Amino acid sequence: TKLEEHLEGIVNIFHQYSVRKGHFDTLSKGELKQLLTKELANTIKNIKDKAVIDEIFQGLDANQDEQVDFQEFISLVAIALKAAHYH
C-alpha cells in the first residue's frame, strides 16, 4: 500500500539520520538538528533557529537520556503531520 509505503518511508528517514553517530537506533541532538533542518524546513516555522531546535529536542527526549528514540520520534511525526495538514 501507498500508506504503508509512506510509513516505511518515515521509518527509513529516521534511520537514515540515526546511524551517523552514537547509537544507531537513536538520534542525538546533532542528528535531530540535521533531520529537522533538512527534512521539515518547510513545515515547522523557524526550524532554522538554534532555540527552536533545542526546544523540540528537549521535548521529545522524554526520558532525559539525551537521545531521541523511535517511540519518542513519533511525537514529532504527529506535530509535523499537524502542520502539513494545515497548509
Chain residues binding Ca ion by CB under 5 A are 18, 21-23, 31, 55, 58, 61, 63-65, 67
To the question of whether residue 69 is assigned a binding role by annotation, the answer is: no
44 binds a second copy (CB under 8 A): yes
**Rounded to 5 degrees, what angle do the CA atoms 29, 35, 36 make?**
85
According to DSSP, residue 27 is labeled B
Considering only residues 11, 20, 23, 48, which one is a binding residue for a second copy as defined by CB under 8 A? 11
23 binds a second copy (CB under 8 A): no
**What is the chain's alpha carbon radius of gyration, rounded to the nearest angstrom?**
13
